[PDB]
Design an enzyme around this catalytic site. Structure first.
Site, PDB file in Angstrom:
ATOM      1  N   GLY B  29       0.817  -1.231   0.000  1.00  0.00           N
ATOM      2  CA  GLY B  29       0.000   0.000   0.000  1.00  0.00           C
ATOM      3  C   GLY B  29       0.841   1.267   0.000  1.00  0.00           C
ATOM      4  CB  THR B  30      -0.126   4.879  -0.537  1.00  0.00           C
ATOM      5  OG1 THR B  30      -1.012   5.263   0.513  1.00  0.00           O
ATOM      6  CG2 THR B  30      -0.940   4.469  -1.747  1.00  0.00           C
ATOM      7  CB  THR B  31       4.161   6.031   2.821  1.00  0.00           C
ATOM      8  OG1 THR B  31       4.927   5.429   1.776  1.00  0.00           O
ATOM      9  CG2 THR B  31       4.950   5.980   4.113  1.00  0.00           C
TER      10      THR B  31
END
Lengths: 240, 243, 244, 241, 195, 111, 250, 235, 231
Positions: B29-31
């Site tokens: 996933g994204t940070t």
């Protein structure tokens, strides 16, 4: 409650549990039905792998659903009892609400419906049973013979057979039953029925059962005594 | 094997491979980060811009629970939303019976027990998210991070998603070089920077920055979104530090 | 999901047989032989126990022969525990009929309901069938003396003499050989023992490995007595017939 | 081999899922120890905060179940908290129904029975935890009762749990073979805590700072856990040998 | 609705049942058969609340007819009466109980003896030489107590009933528009087609 | 004892022309001897060129009008935007009213 | 969607074996040896208290359990399975007997109930059989003293004397030699202590051995007087001391 | 095994796709929709000469303005027809009007995908639902066990369908009379049926706004077979 | 591979194959385009006939007077999700006398799709939706994906060859976003966008479907003779 889908489609578009239910019918003791001109006769093979039977009390292979309709079957004996019980209840329920006994077509369509329901319900296998349903609609003298099978399809037959070596006797009836000329007498229809079993049934001993249904709830089963008299007579007509 | 095909099955090591497989979806996933400050907490997340067809400002990822709690998560977004919806039911039910709004530690265990419950049965799948959440209760500020196993702890700072390692290292710097405390407005700028630094790993597409904060002095102990001016201030601070 | 671990106990083989019923029947074929013989004036139930140990409590015991009501008894072959579940069901079902109709239940009706239960476990529920075959010895005022068997399939049939459990092929041949319709109870008792004597899987057939019961016309005329033999009476009937 | 995936018997009469749950017990790499004083029960567990980003106060495997009952867990935290919440609920419900505080050994039995069910019912997995329950029971005095994924429980004079469990056990075994009594013959709980920490250092062969330990104490009518400072005070006293 | 009578003689059971059906102010019908044949040798007459009477009678009829088919065997009158009692005894603690009283007249073919059973809506059963429900008894039981003998012929039983119906027609305030009479013997059920 | 019904008075009047129809009602809403409102309309456009009034107990009246307006909306969704005939509307309202046969809407409905 | 396991986990194999019952019996075979002996005036059940740690207080773990004041149970196999079975056995003795008839069930009736619970784990959806065999010793007014064995299948048999678990084969042979139909209770306690020595490897004293009798009525153990027809429990657990007393004349 | 409601890597439901195979094995059914009416025709396919052919019911009435032809596991259609009739009669009760043919079809198609771990498997039968309503006139619909339904000017289903459909593609124009469509159904049936088309092994029906849905008697169809054979002799 | 048996199973890489397979059914679906200015929101959908004798599968469903969606993939699933949306719009109207926010429709659809991906015996929805609506904060376009991922966009396209239209809209962004007060020009832009996703066959009268909602326009569908104006 057990939910599992036991009757499902295969890649070739077959339902194997239904087709395997027909294999159980294939193995079942042979049963035959023949339309007379004003009667229907149900013939039933009974296997002789066992004697020392008591035949007063052993379940008879033709069952009365009402006083004017009978049901024979080929396949699992235990399964057949559940279909017979439901049909007998539905027959009394129909009388109670419509104030008329079931038509043979209606009673057939009901049993067929029960058989079909068990081909797309979770946690149940189909009935290992095909049935011949025979009788006369109330205040009607035109005879009725229907067949049901585990899939739930049903249809009317001039004459039909189910169970082991049924392909043999269906070939016999196809050859020995004129639709233009149905067995006119009772004796004539009963004879053609026994003859078709004697292609398959081994001996004329306590191997054959015949039940004869006439109009207006006139149902009577023949005793070995009276069937022997056909077995004796047809045997002496083989002298060509 | 066969030990990794069914959820809630112990491998001969003593591990639940399906939970460990869930973590891979999180890492994918994204940070997303949380910074715990003097009298509050700050949440920031990396929103990848697939296309200029994305309406900017309009695909919000940070979620409020009750009025004083912020939740952000990395991994399967729907799973995160489903967990927040449960968190909202849990916080409403707590408020209803006890009148006081749910304390953050109490709230953390409500999500903890729920997420852990999805590791008990083969008839459910574990959560495909790590959730960074917290806010201001009657005992001051609390930051929490929760993982698909149902494991959670309190944090000084926390990170998850693709850029978790750069963020993790950048958080560790702040804990050392600000030991007595970080202010709310400080943590907002620092959060913006760390998302920009951790965008190194999602270098492919350019992104949209999203910050929220819950400070006793700055937001009165309520969760508010950092919009307009103070946002642009922190975006500018961050642009300066990747030079 | 959980589908992975499901045996599917209620499916057909490609040959149209019920796997679990066939394997249950296989299970019963290793159980102590039980014999029923119907005479003109009564019924005999005889059953061999699985090789008894000499420390096993002999007298106060009945693992094979159970009473259903005052006019009906069963001999068991298979899992004792599975049988007791079905027996308590049958005992209730008999008492329900009596309360409803103020008449003792006809033997077949009781046999049919128990058989219909067994049948259910083969068609729905995804549970294993009952690993039990029954010999039903009973009297009613419609058919008089009746012998039935039921098996895990839910099939039941009537008999003049029948065996279930081990060596039934051997036993059925010996019964078929020496049985005749006019035969009286005391002759049937002697036949039952002679049959187990020849089909037992140990050398000595002693009293301590036998359960015995008779349903006789013998009483105050018109009424039916049901006798579960005490071990001393089995020892007497074993010395009388000269097997010991 | 699907008899390895659910709690059904293997051909050699084994439940592999139960055995593998025991292996999950040591997954935290923490060792716990419990001893009885005259007046008290002391529980000590290793505290390991590997990450600097963690708030060390929120890292605990000791739980205050009731006013009187304390519980230390050897196993992963999600299963630990699952077990803790359940025991808290059970101890509260017991008090409401029966009008007295749930005893240590009764809660142990209850939690053990719950564990047993997961070993027999297939859809429930066992919890990968060993639960050590401590109190000063009003009928039985200082009490240690411990529960495992198998659904086994028993009372203990003293006990240890974790990877280095066998070393700590034999160390305590030897002290009791020698001292020849059921318990630590000590007046204050402070000196029973000191004993516990001492024999942990000897058996593990490692030294502890104030942040390397977690301590819980059960006395008459309250179970409490020591702060970093209460432990630091206790470590400082151990220096005087 | 109103009057239902029964008398067991030497070797038959006679059921007489009023023909009137009254809806408040008007006599809607003067030819109502308050009877169902349960089996070839068992007859049940009924009286009580509108709807409930026929619903209950037809429900019992269906259940007995189902038993007959299943077992290919006619239940004894005792067995049918025990079944019917239990259905009523069941219903009295129902949410809405069946408000029906019945006479069951049967010839027990197995024992070659006629049997009359009187069951009220509570499930109160008795075997009787002669029975009635509601107000019918108050007028007729005095006549039957006097004239009745266990060894009467069927025609003697019909004569004793003719006397009972006359006393009712004299002293009953309600016009019940005469009775339909039915005999249950070894040969089954037939209707005496005027009175 | 709680009485779930009230009477908000008002009067309504429907007359059918050759190629028109009127549905009229007073705009007064009362309880007992008090006036609640001098202008509270109880005759509504329901779309598909149908006008409706449910006069009596205003709560049951508003509930029914609201349910029928919703019935129109779903008739469009389920039957490809087909126009609801006045006779078809009439039959639908019967089922709405009889749906509460044993706890009635205390209203006299005219469309 | 919690419990999907509504199908049997015990099914017949082509050989006609029930796998999970056989495997449960295997688990019982591994279990510590327990035994029972019927005297003429009492019954004795005994087992070894194998300790997990020396730090464990083995008085807390009780392998011999009172079910009713006149019925006791001991087991071989899985202790936790035994513990929940004792709880259900105690409760079923009340719910389906004492709460109906106002007296405790007779031995064979309570055994029948325990057997039923174990049979259901053999057939019900989503459960394994119980991994224990029980020896249930009891007295009732109309049957006198009796001893029963209950197996994972739910099958139960009455015994004059028997043993189960590890050294059962060895112990059953030993009991056959020594058992007669004229044993006084004291003699059967002595024989039980001899039989149990064979199978016990480590320490053999009153603290490693659990032993209970179904003997005479114990008014001293009743807890009240004033009702002349309540004479108190026939079940009695022998103390650590009482066992060591008999290990003298061994 | 594997889930009953699971997707193939292609992104199709296995059980739906396998049911479509069962329908291909079924007896042929053809529908042609004209401005003068919609015609439904079926191959009866008696499995033996002894079974009475007029007991084969593969064309069935739903309301007076809606008819139904089936192909596949015909026993599976019992409950589909029952639901359709109930839906049609129920709509009439609630709205005092005939229920639109599309709305009827949509109702039947809502059953189709209500299966899995509600019924255990999808239906093994496709339906040709043909009717008339005031709004959209004469309509033919194909209702698959996928839950999808298409409107068709003409459509063939069953074993003969692949060839029959390409044959309908040719001969259908927007100005077909009813009589032409009747003949055109007989023609394409005779062309794809194994056994030789007579008035006993094939059956016709139409729905007109005027006379509603009628199944043709064997005598009426026999004279249309004569008319067909005569016609094809010419040119 | 072994991890595509059902939706309750994660792959060792951490993917849900049953969801990815459901996603696949959309790309097999016929192309549909969404785009919106500040005043109007337009759906253009290319409809697919079964053969030459069949009707063209209707791809656009109305949800309220101010909201509606276009579908690509399993139409029965579009029917279930559109029917669920109609109820939520209807509930907001009846209980709160409030036209349901397009942004909230997205959240409810997301949360419904998600439930089918996390528990045993279910299956992901096999359809993607484009939701347009004029609510209390202007014109809106949403892309629903049966993973549960809902995204607010200026324009997009989904289905077979949808990448063509999606890049055209990505180019024409600044042109169409400022078509305020013109309905026809905003539609034209959509019909031009959908043309980038064609091959061999192109837009006829009864294969093309257009929907528009906006400031003074109830959500309405244009078919047959009423789209001839745009070909």
């Amino acid at each position: 409650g057990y939910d599992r889908a036991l009757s499902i489609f295969s890649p070739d578009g077959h339902i194997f549990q239904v087709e395997y239910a027909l294999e159980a019918v294939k193995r079942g003791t042979c049963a035959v039905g023949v339309k007379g001109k004003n009667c229907v006769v149900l013939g039933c093979e009974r296997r002789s792998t066992l004697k020392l039977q008591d035949t007063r009390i052993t379940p008879s292979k033709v069952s009365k659903i009402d006083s004017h309709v009978v049901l024979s079957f080929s396949g699992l004996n235990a399964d057949s009892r559940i279909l017979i019980e439901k049909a007998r209840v539905e027959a009394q329920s129909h009388r109670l609400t419509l104030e008329d006994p079931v038509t043979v077509e209606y009673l057939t369509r009901y049993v067929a419906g029960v058989q079909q329901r068990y081909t797309q319900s979770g946690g149940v296998r189909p009935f290992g049973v095909s049935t011949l349903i025979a009788g006369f609609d109330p205040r009607d003298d035109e005879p009725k013979l229907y067949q049901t099978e585990p899939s739930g399809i049903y249809s009317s037959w001039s004459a039909q057979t189910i169970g082991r070596n049924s392909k043999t006797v269906r070939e016999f009836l196809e050859k020995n039953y004129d639709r233009k000329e149905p067995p006119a007498t009772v004796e004539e229809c009963v004879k053609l029925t026994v003859r078709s079993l004697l292609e398959v049934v081994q001996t004329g001993a306590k191997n054959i059962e015949i039940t004869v249904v006439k109009p207006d709830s006139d149902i009577v089963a023949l005793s070995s005594e009276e069937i022997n008299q056909y077995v004796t007579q047809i045997e002496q007509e083989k002298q060509e | 094997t066969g030990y990794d095909l069914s959820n809630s099955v112990f491998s001969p090591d003593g591990r639940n491979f399906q939970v460990e497989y869930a973590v891979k979806a999180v890492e994918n996933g994204t940070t997303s980060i949380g910074i715990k400050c003097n009298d509050g907490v700050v949440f920031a997340v990396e929103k990848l811009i697939t296309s200029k067809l994305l309406v900017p400002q309009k695909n919000v990822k940070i979620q409020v629970v009750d009025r004083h709690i912020g939740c952000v998560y990395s991994g399967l977004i729907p799973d995160g939303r489903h967990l927040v919806n449960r968190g909202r039911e849990e916080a409403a039910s707590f408020k209803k019976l006890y009148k006081t709004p749910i304390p953050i530690p109490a709230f953390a265990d409500r999500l903890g027990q729920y997420v852990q419950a999805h590791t008990l049965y083969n008839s459910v799948r574990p959560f495909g998210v790590s959730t960074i959440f917290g806010g201001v209760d009657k005992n001051g500020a609390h930051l929490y991070m929760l993982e698909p196993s149902g494991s959670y702890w309190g944090y000084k700072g926390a990170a998850t998603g693709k850029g978790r390692q750069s963020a993790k290292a950048e958080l560790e710097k702040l804990v050392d070089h600000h030991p007595e405390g970080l202010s709310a407005r400080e943590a907002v700028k620092q959060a913006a920077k760390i998302i920009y630094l951790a965008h190194e790993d999602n270098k492919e597409k350019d992104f949209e920055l999203e910050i929220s904060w819950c400070s006793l002095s700055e937001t009165n102990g309520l969760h508010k979104f950092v919009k307009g001016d103070l946002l642009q201030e922190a975006i500018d601070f961050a642009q300066k530090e990747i030079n | 999901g959980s589908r992975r671990y499901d045996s599917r106990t209620t499916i057909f083989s490609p040959e149209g047989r019920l796997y679990q019923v066939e394997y249950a029947l296989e299970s019963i074929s290793h159980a102590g032989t039980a014999i029923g013989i119907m005479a003109s004036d009564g019924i005999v139930l005889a059953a061999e126990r699985k090789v008894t140990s000499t420390l096993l409590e002999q007298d106060t015991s009945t693992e094979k022969l159970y009473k259903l009501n005052d006019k009906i008894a069963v001999a068991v072959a298979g899992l004792t525990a599975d049988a007791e579940i079905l027996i308590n069901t049958a005992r209730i079902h008999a008492q329900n009929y009596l309360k409803t109709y103020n008449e003792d239940i006809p033997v077949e009706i009781l046999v049919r309901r128990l058989s219909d239960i067994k049948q259910g476990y083969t068609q729905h529920g995804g549970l294993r069938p009952f690993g039990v075959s029954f010999i039903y010895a009973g009297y009613d005022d419609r058919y008089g003396y009746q012998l039935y068997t039921s098996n895990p399939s839910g099939n039941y049939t009537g008999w003049k003499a029948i065996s279930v459990g081990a060596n039934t092929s051997a036993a059925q041949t010996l019964l078929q050989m020496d049985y005749k319709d006019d035969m009286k109870v005391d002759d049937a008792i002697e036949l039952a023992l002679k049959t187990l004597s020849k089909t037992t899987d140990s050398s000595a057939l002693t009293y301590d490995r036998l359960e015995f019961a008779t349903i006789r016309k013998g009483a105050n005329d018109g009424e039916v007595y049901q006798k579960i033999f005490k071990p001393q009476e089995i020892k007497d009937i074993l010395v009388k017939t000269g097997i010991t | 081999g699907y008899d390895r995936h659910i709690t059904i018997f293997s051909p050699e009469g084994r439940l592999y899922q139960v055995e593998y749950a025991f292996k999950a017990t040591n997954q935290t790499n923490i060792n716990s120890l419990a001893v009885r004083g005259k007046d008290c029960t002391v529980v000590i567990s290793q505290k390991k905060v590997p990450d600097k980003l963690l708030d060390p106060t929120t890292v605990s495997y000791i739980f205050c179940i009731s006013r009187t009952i304390g519980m230390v867990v050897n196993g992963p935290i999600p299963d630990a908290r699952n077990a803790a919440l359940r025991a808290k609920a059970e101890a509260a419900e017991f008090r409401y129904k029966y009008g007295y505080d749930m005893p240590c050994d009764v809660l142990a039995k209850r939690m053990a029975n719950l564990s047993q069910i997961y070993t027999q019912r297939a859809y429930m997995r066992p919890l990968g935890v060993i639960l050590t329950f401590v109190s000063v029971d009003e009928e039985l005095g200082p009490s240690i009762y411990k529960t495992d994924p198998a659904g086994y429980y028993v009372g203990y004079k003293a006990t240890a749990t974790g990877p280095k469990q066998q070393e700590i056990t034999t160390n305590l075994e030897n002290h009791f073979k020698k001292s020849k009594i059921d318990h630590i013959n000590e007046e204050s709980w402070e000196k029973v805590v000191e004993f516990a920490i001492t024999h942990m250092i000897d058996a593990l062969g490692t030294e502890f700072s104030k942040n390397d330990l977690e301590v819980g104490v059960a006395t008459k009518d309250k179970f409490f856990t020591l702060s970093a400072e209460n432990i630091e005070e206790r470590l400082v006293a151990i220096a005087e040998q | 609705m109103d009057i239902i009578l029964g008398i067991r003689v030497q070797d038959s059971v006679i059921l007489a049942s009023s023909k009137a059906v009254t809806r408040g102010i008007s006599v809607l019908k003067d030819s109502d058969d308050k009877t169902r044949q349960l089996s070839p040798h068992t007859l049940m007459s009924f009286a009580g609340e509108a709807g409930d009477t026929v619903q209950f009678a037809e429900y019992i009829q269906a259940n007995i007819q189902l038993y007959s088919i299943r077992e290919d065997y006619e239940l004894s009158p005792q067995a049918v009466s025990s079944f019917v009692r239990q259905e009523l005894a069941k219903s009295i603690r129902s949410r809405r109980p069946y408000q029906v009283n019945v006479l069951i007249g049967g010839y027990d073919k197995k024992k070659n003896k006629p049997e009359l059973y009187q069951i009220d809506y509570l499930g109160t059963k008795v075997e009787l030489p002669y029975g009635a429900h509601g107000y019918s008894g108050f007028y007729t039981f005095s006549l039957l107590d006097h004239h009745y003998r266990p060894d009467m012929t069927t025609e003697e039983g019909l004569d004793l009933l003719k006397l009972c119906v006359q006393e009712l027609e004299k002293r009953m305030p309600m016009d019940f528009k005469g009775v339909i009479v039915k005999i249950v013997d070894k040969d089954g059920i037939r209707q005496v087609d005027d009175f | 004892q709680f009485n779930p019904y009230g009477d908000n008075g008002g009067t309504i009047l429907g007359i059918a022309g050759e190629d028109f129809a009127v549905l009229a009602g007073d705009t007064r809403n009362i309880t007992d001897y008090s006036i609640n409102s001098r202008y509270e309309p109880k005759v509504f456009d329901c779309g598909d060129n149908i006008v409706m009034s449910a006069n009596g107990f205003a709560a049951d009246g508003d509930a029914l009008v609201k349910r029928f307006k919703n019935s129109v909306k779903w008739y469009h969704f389920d039957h490809n935007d087909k126009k609801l005939s006045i006779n078809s509307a009439a039959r639908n309202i019967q089922h709405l009213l009889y749906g509460k046969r044993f706890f009635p809407y205390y209203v006299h409905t005219i469309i | 969607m919690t419990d999907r396991y509504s199908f049997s986990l015990t099914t017949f194999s082509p050989s006609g074996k029930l796998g999970q019952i056989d495997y449960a019996l295997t688990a019982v075979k591994q279990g510590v040896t327990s035994l029972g002996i019927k005297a003429t005036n009492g019954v004795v059940i005994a087992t070894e208290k194998k300790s997990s740690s020396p730090l464990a207080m083995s008085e807390t773990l009780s392998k011999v359990s009172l079910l009713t004041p006149d019925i006791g149970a001991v087991y071989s196999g899985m202790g936790p399975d035994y513990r929940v079975l004792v709880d259900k056995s105690r409760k079923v003795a009340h719910t389906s007997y004492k709460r109906i008839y106002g007296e405790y069930p007779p031995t064979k009736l309570l055994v029948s109930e325990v057997a039923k619970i174990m049979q259901e784990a053999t057939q019900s959806g989503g459960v394994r059989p119980f991994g224990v065999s029980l020896l249930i010793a009891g007295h009732d007014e109309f049957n006198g003293f009796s001893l029963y064995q209950v197996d994972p299948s739910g099958s139960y048999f009455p015994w004059k004397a028997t043993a189960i678990g590890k050294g059962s084969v060895a112990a059953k042979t030993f009991l056959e030699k020594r058992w007669n139909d004229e044993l006084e209770l004291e003699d059967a306690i002595h024989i039980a202590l001899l039989t149990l020595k064979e199978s016990v490897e480590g320490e053999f004293n009153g603290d490693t051995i659990e032993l209970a009798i179904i003997g005479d009525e114990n008014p001293d153990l009743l807890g009240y007087t004033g009702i002349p027809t309540d004479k108190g429990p026939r079940f009695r657990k022998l103390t650590s001391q009482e066992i060591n007393d008999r290990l003298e004349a061994l | 095994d594997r889930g009953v409601s699971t997707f193939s890597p292609e992104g199709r439901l296995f059980q739906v796709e396998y049911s479509l195979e069962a329908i291909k094995l079924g007896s042929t059914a053809i529908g042609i929709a004209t401005k003068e009416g919609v015609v439904l025709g079926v191959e009866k396919r008696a499995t033996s000469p002894l079974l009475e052919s007029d007991s084969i019911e593969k064309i069935v009435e739903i309301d007076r303005h809606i008819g139904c032809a089936m192909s596949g596991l015909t026993a599976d259609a019992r409950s589909m027809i029952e639901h359709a009739r109930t839906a049609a009669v129920t709509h009439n009760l609630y709205y005092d009007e005939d229920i639109n043919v599309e709305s009827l079809t949509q109702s039947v198609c809502d059953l189709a995908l209500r299966f899995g771990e509600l019924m255990s498997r999808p239906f093994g039968v496709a339906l040709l639902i043909a009717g008339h309503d005031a709004d959209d006139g004469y309509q033919l619909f194909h209702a698959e066990p996928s839950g999808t339904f298409y409107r068709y000017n003409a459509k063939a289903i069953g074993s003969g369908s692949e060839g029959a459909q390409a044959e309908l593609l040719n001969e259908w124009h927007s100005s077909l009379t009813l009589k032409e469509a009747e003949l055109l159904v007989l023609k394409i049936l005779k062309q794809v049926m194994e056994e030789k088309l007579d008035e006993n092994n094939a059956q016709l029906s139409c729905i007109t706004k005027q006379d509603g849905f009628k199944i043709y008697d064997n005598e009426k169809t026999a004279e249309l077979i004569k008319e067909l054979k005569e016609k094809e002799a010419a040119e | 591979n072994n991890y595509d048996g059902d939706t309750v199973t994660f792959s060792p890489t951490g993917r849900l194959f049953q969801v990815e397979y459901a996603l696949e059914a959309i790309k097999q679906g016929s192309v549909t385009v969404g785009l919106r200015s500040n005043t109007h929101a337009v759906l253009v959908a290319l409809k697919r006939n079964a053969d030459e004798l069949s009707s063209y599968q209707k791809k656009i469903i109305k949800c309220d007077e101010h909201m509606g969606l276009s579908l690509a993939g399993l139409a029965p699933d579009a029917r279930v999700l559109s029917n669920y949306l109609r109820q939520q719009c209807n509930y907001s109207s009846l209980v709160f006398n409030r036209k349901l926010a397009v942004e909230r429709a997205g959240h409810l659809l997301c949360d419904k799709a998600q439930k089918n991906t996390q528990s045993y015996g279910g299956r992901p929805y096999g359809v993607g939706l484009l939701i347009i609506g004029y609510d209390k904060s202007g014109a809106h376009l949403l892309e629903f994906q049966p993973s549960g991922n809902v995204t607010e966009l200026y324009g997009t396209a989904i289905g077979a060859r949808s990448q063509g239209a999606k890049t055209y809209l990505e180019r024409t962004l600044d042109t169409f976003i400022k078509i305020d007060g013109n309905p026809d020009e905003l539609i034209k832009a959509g019909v031009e966008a959908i043309s980038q996703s064609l091959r061999d066959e192109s837009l006829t009268v009864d294969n093309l479907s257009i929907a528009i909602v906006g400031k003074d326009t109830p959500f309405t569908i244009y078919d047959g003779e009423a789209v001839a104006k745009y070909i």
